[PDB]
Amino acid sequence: LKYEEIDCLINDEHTIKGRREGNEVFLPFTWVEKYFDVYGKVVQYDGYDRFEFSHSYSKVYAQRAPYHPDGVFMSFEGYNVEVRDRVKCISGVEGVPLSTQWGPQGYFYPIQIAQYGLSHYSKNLTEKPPHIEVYETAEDRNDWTVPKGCFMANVADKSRFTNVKQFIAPETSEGVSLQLGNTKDFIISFDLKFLTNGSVSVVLETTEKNQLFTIHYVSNAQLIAFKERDIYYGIGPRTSWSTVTRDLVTDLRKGVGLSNTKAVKPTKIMPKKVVRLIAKGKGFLDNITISTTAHMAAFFAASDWLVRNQDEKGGWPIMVTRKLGEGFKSLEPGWYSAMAQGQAISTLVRAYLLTKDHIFLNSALRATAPYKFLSEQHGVKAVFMNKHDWYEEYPTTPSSFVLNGFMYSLIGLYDLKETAGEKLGKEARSLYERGMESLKAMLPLYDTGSGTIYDLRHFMLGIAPNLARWDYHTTHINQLQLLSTIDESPVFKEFVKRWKSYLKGSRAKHN
Amino acid sequence: LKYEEIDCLINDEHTIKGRREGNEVFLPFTWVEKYFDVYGKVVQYDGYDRFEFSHSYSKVYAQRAPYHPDGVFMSFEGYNVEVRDRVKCISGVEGVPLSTQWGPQGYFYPIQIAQYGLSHYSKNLTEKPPHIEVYETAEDRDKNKPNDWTVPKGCFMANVADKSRFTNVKQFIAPETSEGVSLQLGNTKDFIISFDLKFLTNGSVSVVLETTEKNQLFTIHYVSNAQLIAFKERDIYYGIGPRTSWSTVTRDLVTDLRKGVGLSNTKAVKPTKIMPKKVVRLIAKGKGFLDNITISTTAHMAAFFAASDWLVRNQDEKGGWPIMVTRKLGEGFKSLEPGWYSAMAQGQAISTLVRAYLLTKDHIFLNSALRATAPYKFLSEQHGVKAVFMNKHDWYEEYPTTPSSFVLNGFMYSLIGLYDLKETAGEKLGKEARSLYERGMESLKAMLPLYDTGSGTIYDLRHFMLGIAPNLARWDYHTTHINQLQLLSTIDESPVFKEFVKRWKSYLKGSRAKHN
Numbered sequence A: 001l002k003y004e005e006i007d008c009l010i011n012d013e014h015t016i017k018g019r020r021e022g023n024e025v026f027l028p029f030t031w032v033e034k035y036f037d038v039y040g041k042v043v044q045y046d047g048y049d050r051f052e053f054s055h056s057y058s059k060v061y062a063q064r065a066p067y068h069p070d071g072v073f074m075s076f077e078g079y080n081v082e083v084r085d086r087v088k089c090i091s092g093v094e095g096v097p098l099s100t101q102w103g104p105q106g107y108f109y110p111i112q113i114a115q116y117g118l119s120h121y122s123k124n125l126t127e128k129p130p131h132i133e134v135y136e137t138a139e140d141r142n143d144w145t146v147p148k149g150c151f152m153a154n155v156a157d158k159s160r161f162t163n164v165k166q167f168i169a170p171e172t173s174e175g176v177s178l179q180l181g182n183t184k185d186f187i188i189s190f191d192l193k194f195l196t197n198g199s200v201s202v203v204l205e206t207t208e209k210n211q212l213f214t215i216h217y218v219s220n221a222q223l224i225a226f227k228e229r230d231i232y233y234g235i236g237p238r239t240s241w242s243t244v245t246r247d248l249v250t251d252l253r254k255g256v257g258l259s260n261t262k263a264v265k266p267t268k269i270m271p272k273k274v275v276r277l278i279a280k281g282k283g284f285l286d287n288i289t290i291s292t293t294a295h296m297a298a299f300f301a302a303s304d305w306l307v308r309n310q311d312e313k314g315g316w317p318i319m320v321t322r323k324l325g326e327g328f329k330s331l332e333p334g335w336y337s338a339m340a341q342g343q344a345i346s347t348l349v350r351a352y353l354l355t356k357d358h359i360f361l362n363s364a365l366r367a368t369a370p371y372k373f374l375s376e377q378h379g380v381k382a383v384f385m386n387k388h389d390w391y392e393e394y395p396t397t398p399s400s401f402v403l404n405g406f407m408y409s410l411i412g413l414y415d416l417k418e419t420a421g422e423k424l425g426k427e428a429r430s431l432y433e434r435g436m437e438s439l440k441a442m443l444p445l446y447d448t449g450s451g452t453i454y455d456l457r458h459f460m461l462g463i464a465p466n467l468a469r470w471d472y473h474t475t476h477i478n479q480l481q482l483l484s485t486i487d488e489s490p491v492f493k494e495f496v497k498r499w500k501s502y503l504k505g506s507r508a509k510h511n
Numbered sequence B: 001l002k003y004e005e006i007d008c009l010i011n012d013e014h015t016i017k018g019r020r021e022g023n024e025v026f027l028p029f030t031w032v033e034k035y036f037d038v039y040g041k042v043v044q045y046d047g048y049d050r051f052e053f054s055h056s057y058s059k060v061y062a063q064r065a066p067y068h069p070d071g072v073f074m075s076f077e078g079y080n081v082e083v084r085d086r087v088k089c090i091s092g093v094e095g096v097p098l099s100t101q102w103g104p105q106g107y108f109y110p111i112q113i114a115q116y117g118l119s120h121y122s123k124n125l126t127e128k129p130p131h132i133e134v135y136e137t138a139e140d141r142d143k144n145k146p147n148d149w150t151v152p153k154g155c156f157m158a159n160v161a162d163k164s165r166f167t168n169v170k171q172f173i174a175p176e177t178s179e180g181v182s183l184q185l186g187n188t189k190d191f192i193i194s195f196d197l198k199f200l201t202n203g204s205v206s207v208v209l210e211t212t213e214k215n216q217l218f219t220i221h222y223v224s225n226a227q228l229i230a231f232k233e234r235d236i237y238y239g240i241g242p243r244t245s246w247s248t249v250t251r252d253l254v255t256d257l258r259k260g261v262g263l264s265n266t267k268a269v270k271p272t273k274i275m276p277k278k279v280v281r282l283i284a285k286g287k288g289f290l291d292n293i294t295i296s297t298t299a300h301m302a303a304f305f306a307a308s309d310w311l312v313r314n315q316d317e318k319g320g321w322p323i324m325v326t327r328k329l330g331e332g333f334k335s336l337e338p339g340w341y342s343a344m345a346q347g348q349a350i351s352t353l354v355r356a357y358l359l360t361k362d363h364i365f366l367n368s369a370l371r372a373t374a375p376y377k378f379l380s381e382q383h384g385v386k387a388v389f390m391n392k393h394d395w396y397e398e399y400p401t402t403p404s405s406f407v408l409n410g411f412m413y414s415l416i417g418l419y420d421l422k423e424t425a426g427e428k429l430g431k432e433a434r435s436l437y438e439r440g441m442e443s444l445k446a447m448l449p450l451y452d453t454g455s456g457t458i459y460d461l462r463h464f465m466l467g468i469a470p471n472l473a474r475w476d477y478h479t480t481h482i483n484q485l486q487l488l489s490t491i492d493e494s495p496v497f498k499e500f501v502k503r504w505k506s507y508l509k510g511s512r513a514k515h516n
């Protein structure tokens, strides 16, 4: 195959090496990939090599049905919140993500918590039912080890209509130990009440050279800690009955990856066997279980967190500073987010539809309040050019007009208005209608002709556009694809189609 | 590792043929060019080939100095309006371009005429002075050669005083059936012919050209009627009107030849490579007078003034140059019925007229420029050019559509016109221009970001106004945007103009704004 090397001058400033066969010139992908910011690689199949080029690796969610409030939440069946490195851990006390997106301290960010919930809710609807192995009920329907100094016994508990295992072990002892031996499933679950302080510990055989790591759930409020091969999580007093549910995969990886930075250090470590459970102090223990997944317990932990942490104004105040960029006043702690409000509402509505417990709906109804107040009056409302109401992901001065957060704020209002009924849904209905009018009018401002912009800070600050990376662009499409199944407006379908095409390299026509 | 074919799947839908050497994959430029919409070619040097790649195709004008109203007009020293295929010819009557931009009929489009003038004005300031050869003054300077008239049977000629304009003049009588009276010229280098002319009766002044089409003689007849342009075989006819009063006729024989032989019924002049190589002789028919016969390399100021005079005579009572063709800007935009005004026309005309005023101090030019701001005060629906963006920023429309269109380049030309006028008119009379400019520049600074894609510019805001895809600016309009902003940046020290120019320039060599 006869070819000639040829110098290839690039915009009169750099020379790269190409190849030539008569008139056809061939450019190295090393250059193409960097210069155009595109993707490809050689893929080896049985008796066929093929280079495979992509404009992006991000992919649009394959919607299977029109959206409905009790169904999967957009594309979140495929999200995995807990592996994100901005999640420092799943809180021992609250059973939800503690995030570190903006500083290393670790704070409850409501969005991450709602997305934890929504993603698990969605996986509950799409994944295969979990295998559930029961190790201890305490009934009449063993392999505990009680060393000297310790006692164990089955006892009635009238308070909760069951039999229960009581244990007494001092902290100087080896504790009382239940052999488990699960090779496949790593979500451990048990009912727990402590009389005195103590610990429930889980020993794991890992893939790090066959070593045993132990995860201690201790009855204090201690921040996550990691020494050698011991991981410590504070689960609070548990001096009343509650179900503890812990993903040993996540809990192991977050412990070994413990960092003083805003990102968990990557680790490959996996548990390969849940060896045994170790009880110390004085207390009670029931329903000891290992499951493939515990999606509804994750969903409810998020739901209950939202109910308990909503403030008197119906907001989830965000208790860290956020500096959105030069030009934007810094957001002082206690700011609200339209994305938080909406995602929370979408979570609470789902909790209500499952349980019929009006505590969930009552929280969702209150959560519209911040939508009514401008950013400078402790709300999330912004007005674009004295004409279009908007609900801000970041209620900055000047206004920021972030697209994706806004669309989640609307999906929440849709969820609520479809669920509250005509009377009580009035406020949600009205905020939604106004918001969808704004969105239809303003969508074109986010369209570059070969991508989307993330926000309107170019217009509001007089600077370069803050273009959306491909994964945010895909989110825009997923959002509009969703809206397009609950609102029959042609504009949503047109924009979805064009925005999809951008992902495969299509451009708007030039003149 | 040896050069080998490899299949290359593109976005999981089409397979192209590339090459591979070990790990390095090489993609055909045939694909790269079309998929990313870029440019390149193999260029031949002495025993050495090189492929040359460009992200874009236009270039930014190298601005030399801060802009001022009596200087060159932006980049227009490098425009050549008359060779554009949308210029059907230079009118014999009006001495300015007749254009065919949207319909084949041919109409006087103000923008093309203003640009004709501004470009010649700018060339006057940058080109070398023209060589000027004088063939007849009719005085007593004409004792030695050139003599050179052939006055055949039936015809007469004489030098005669003309009290009307304090000079001697050549009088001619030739019937139109004769071969006419003929002055040998023989210029090989210069092709702009110029002569003062008054006709008593009908007639023609004709110019014979040796051309590069196998040495053939073509004759261009400037005839005393309003007939526009005709072409049979080797004769070209232009109507120059009665000329029964003294006037300077000035004609580019290159253009006049090429427009004639390229005469078409379509929107575009047929391309030709025919050039004149010799202006052989001038032929006078009918009864009249003839003075100051000249051939020059260029006649920039005559072109400029022809444009200026056309603008003064054709301005309407509303101070506009009405555009007399229907214009449908695109689906969603109401059709513009004839008589619509353009902010680009108004501004460019003003920039022309101000320059004419600064040169001549004839207040007719300034007063026409002052009237030309009136359409800027009136909304599109009231037969002006003003649009308002979201109840907040005044704008001056290139196309005063419903809904508003907000075309960027037209707007910036409308502002450079107002700048020229307000800098020139003085405190009292410049008030209106001052105010329209200030409001315009405030709008521009606020709205510039809406035209920035992060790797190009948008031409207009039809995407926002109609709910459709952006009308992205082709690269030559992108460089126009930069040339405009580069100019404004020398008359307004706002940092925003400097930052945008720099970023917009970087887009030309494939830089992008950062993604998040």
Ligand SMILES: *[C@@H]1O[C@H](CO)[C@@H](O[C@@H]2O[C@H](CO)[C@@H](O[C@@H]3O[C@H](CO[C@H]4O[C@H](CO)[C@@H](O)[C@H](O)[C@@H]4O)[C@@H](O)[C@H](O[C@H]4O[C@H](CO)[C@@H](O)[C@H](O)[C@@H]4O)[C@@H]3O)[C@H](O)[C@H]2NC(C)=O)[C@H](O)[C@H]1NC(C)=O
Pocket: A160, A161, A162, A164, A191, A192, A241, A285, A286, A287
């Ligand atoms: C380990 O796991 C098991 C589940 O497998 C748990 O055992 C269950 O415990 C719950 C208590 O939380 C039991 O639910 C309660 O049942 C009580 C009586 O049920 C029987 O009798 C009634 C007549 O009253 C019959 O109708 C019924 O069919 C049963 O035969 C109820 O009194 C409780 O009602 C509560 O809710 C209502 C509102 O709905 C309140 O108004 C009441 O005041 C009251 O609070 C409740 O329904 C459940 O039956 C147990 N199941 C079994 C099979 O034992 C263990 O609790 C768990 N371990 C720990 C430590 O939590």
Ligand SMILES: *[C@@H]1O[C@H](CO)[C@@H](O[C@@H]2O[C@H](CO)[C@@H](O[C@@H]3O[C@H](CO[C@H]4O[C@H](CO)[C@@H](O)[C@H](O)[C@@H]4O)[C@@H](O)[C@H](O[C@H]4O[C@H](CO)[C@@H](O)[C@H](O)[C@@H]4O)[C@@H]3O)[C@H](O)[C@H]2NC(C)=O)[C@H](O)[C@H]1NC(C)=O
Pocket: B164, B165, B166, B167, B169, B196, B197, B246, B291, B292
């Ligand atoms: C061929 O080319 C030659 C020049 O190359 C031309 O000859 C010149 O043409 C003009 C014709 O008008 C002569 O212009 C001079 O105008 C003076 C006043 O005119 C102005 O001011 C009055 C105000 O009352 C207005 O009415 C008028 O419209 C103008 O605004 C006259 O006064 C001149 O006459 C004498 O005065 C001047 C100084 O003021 C003396 O220096 C002169 O020598 C002269 O005696 C004169 O009319 C100009 O002088 C001509 N130049 C020469 C050298 O002859 C031809 O016109 C051109 N051929 C054709 C056919 O156009």
Ligand SMILES: *[C@@H]1O[C@H](CO)[C@@H](O[C@@H]2O[C@H](CO)[C@@H](O[C@@H]3O[C@H](CO[C@H]4O[C@H](CO)[C@@H](O)[C@H](O)[C@@H]4O)[C@@H](O)[C@H](O)[C@@H]3O)[C@H](O)[C@H]2NC(C)=O)[C@H](O)[C@H]1NC(C)=O
Pocket: A123, A124, A125, A126, A127, A128, A129, A130, A132, A134, A137, A287, A293, A295, A296
């Ligand atoms: C999505 O969430 C759904 C709702 O939470 C899940 O379906 C539910 O799955 C459970 C099965 O784990 C069913 O609960 C009961 O199961 C018992 C079996 O006895 C055991 O139960 C107790 C604990 O309560 C245990 O301690 C005992 O020792 C036993 O081992 C049945 O006998 C009951 O009748 C009852 O079925 C729910 O019924 C079931 N609900 C529904 C609506 O299906 C679903 O699996 C989740 N899916 C995913 C993919 O996560």
Ligand SMILES: *[C@@H]1O[C@H](CO)[C@@H](O[C@@H]2O[C@H](CO)[C@@H](O)[C@H](O)[C@H]2NC(C)=O)[C@H](O)[C@H]1NC(C)=O
Pocket: B123, B124, B125, B126, B127, B128, B129, B130, B132, B298, B299, B300, B301
């Ligand atoms: C630009 O225009 C000016 C007209 O002012 C030209 O300068 C004149 O040239 C004529 C013809 O040779 C002379 O009669 C004058 O003496 C000149 N006037 C001045 C003020 O210099 C100039 O030649 C033109 N230049 C170009 C490149 O077109």
Ligand SMILES: *[C@@H]1O[C@H](CO)[C@@H](O)[C@H](O)[C@H]1NC(C)=O
Pocket: A169, A170, A171, A197, A198, A199, A280, A281, A282
């Ligand atoms: C309870 O707390 C004390 C310190 O406050 C600690 O020393 C002790 O070991 C704890 N008890 C158990 C059973 O872990």
Ligand SMILES: [Ca+2]
Pocket: A137, A138, A139, A162, A163, A164, A286, A287
């Ligand atoms: Ca029990």
Ligand SMILES: [Ca+2]
Pocket: B136, B137, B138, B139, B167, B168, B169, B291, B292
């Ligand atoms: Ca004379």
Ligand SMILES: [Cl-]
Pocket: A078, A079, A080, A081, A084
């Ligand atoms: Cl995710």
Ligand SMILES: [Cl-]
Pocket: B078, B079, B080, B081, B084
């Ligand atoms: Cl041009």
